[PDB]
């Protein structure tokens, strides 16, 4: 508890850099990370209502953008085309195509939902894997646990079988590490 009564403040960045606590330095640097909600809101706003937004440092997620734009059938053909052929396109190229294709509108993303709705397929998949039941029975079990059984309680132990090899079948890419940490803490 600071043996020394130093008048130097060491404002949470001096302590991280002077002490060479590279973990603390990384935490301090991430302290300037814009929360994903507003980054995604800006990206989807640029895509939906044509706006001068550039993604160079933004953590652009192809899957998040596609499944937040697919809620609307108006911009479904663009999402479908970038689903078929988007894989392999540079994130900038994917964003440019979505900008040029997605016609216009506001669409009111509601990022709070599409984050959980994007994990529904993964939950069904690993719940059918753990219980060795078909995906229909997996969704039935998921619905049952939401009411009785405390689905989080099951997921606490279920997290142990989300292997790096298992996630490959859920989606084919290297950004699948997002749900690795997402399901790394499910409690």
């Amino acid at each position: 508890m600071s043996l020394f009564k130093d008048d130097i403040q060491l404002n949470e960045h001096q302590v991280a850099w002077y002490s060479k606590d590279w973990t603390a330095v990384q935490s301090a640097a991430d302290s300037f990370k814009e929360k994903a909600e507003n980054e995604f809101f800006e990206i989807i706003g640029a895509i939906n209502n044509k706006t001068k937004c550039s993604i160079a440092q933004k953590d652009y997620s192809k899957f998040m953008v596609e499944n937040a734009l697919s809620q609307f059938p108006e911009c479904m053909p663009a999402v479908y085309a970038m689903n078929l052929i988007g894989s392999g396109l540079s994130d900038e190229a994917h964003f440019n195509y979505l900008m040029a294709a997605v016609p216009r509108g506001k669409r009111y993303g509601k990022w709070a939902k599409l984050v959980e709705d994007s994990t529904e397929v993964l939950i069904i998949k690993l719940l059918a894997k753990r219980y060795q039941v078909n995906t229909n029975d997996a969704i039935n079990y998921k619905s049952i646990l939401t009411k009785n059984g405390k689905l989080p309680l099951v997921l606490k132990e279920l997290k142990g079988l989300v292997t790096d090899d298992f996630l490959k079948e859920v989606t084919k890419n290297v950004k699948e590490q997002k749900q690795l940490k997402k399901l790394a803490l499910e409690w």
């Binding site: 508890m1 600071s2 043996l3 020394f4 130093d6 130097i8 060491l10 001096q14 302590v15 002077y18 002490s19 060479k20 606590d21």
Partner: protein
């Protein structure tokens, strides 16, 4: 100056506390963690003849190891350290004194409320087990009239109720009860026999490990009591 192998080893051990050490003219070397939680000091056998601040003590000692013991460390023209060997000269950049956290004056430790002793083997085993068992914190408590260092994994159990490792130091002559908590991240003492002597007045306390070479002082966590 000249840095003997003993002084260089002591400085190398200190480098684990503070990445940089503000050396000062004389025979005293002392370093504090940037957090201020850990303090270390020692009386060296060499003579530091100029006040220089080093922002990378590990690298400085790595360079010192290459040159022979005869190497004479002298301040360069532009203030940089200059390890001058018999045939090779090495220039080391002296850090900016602002960018190296060092104590202004030595920590004068008051009279210890409880004075104990820790054996070198016991302390080494404690340090190794801490890594082995994931012992985030410890507690120098009294159990059945003896001083015991109980290690807990504070990340798992926050109440500090399960002792994943218990070390008995000796019989407590006094009659006071305390639960001094010392985080394992602040246990940077080098191997050796340490006469750790605790102290806690009010809500502020500190544990000092008076060793043969260095005298480390560790800030007791906020959950230590020693209510007397």
């Amino acid at each position: 100056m000249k840095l003997s192998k003993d002084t260089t080893a002591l400085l190398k051990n200190f480098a684990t506390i503070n990445s940089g050490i503000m050396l000062k003219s004389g025979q005293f070397i002392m370093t504090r963690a940037v957090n201020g939680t850990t303090y270390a000091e020692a009386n060296i056998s060499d003579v530091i003849d100029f006040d220089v601040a080093i922002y990378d003590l590990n690298g400085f000692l790595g360079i010192l190891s290459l040159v022979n013991d005869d190497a004479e460390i002298s301040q360069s023209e532009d203030g940089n350290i200059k390890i001058a060997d018999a045939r090779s000269t090495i220039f080391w950049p002296a850090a900016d004194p602002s960018t190296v956290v060092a104590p202004n004056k030595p920590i004068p430790f008051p009279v210890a409320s409880a004075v104990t002793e820790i054996k070198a083997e016991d302390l080494q085993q404690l340090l190794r087990v801490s890594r082995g068992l994931q012992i985030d914190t410890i507690a120098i408590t009294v159990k059945e009239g003896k001083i015991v260092i109980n290690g807990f994994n504070k990340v798992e159990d926050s109440a500090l109720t399960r002792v994943k490792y218990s070390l008995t130091l000796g019989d407590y002559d006094g009659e006071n009860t305390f639960n001094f908590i010392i985080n394992m991240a602040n246990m940077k003492m080098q191997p050796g026999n340490y006469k750790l002597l605790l102290w806690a007045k009010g809500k502020q306390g500190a544990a000092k490990f008076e060793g043969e070479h260095a005298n480390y002082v560790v800030a007791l966590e906020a959950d230590s009591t020693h209510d007397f």
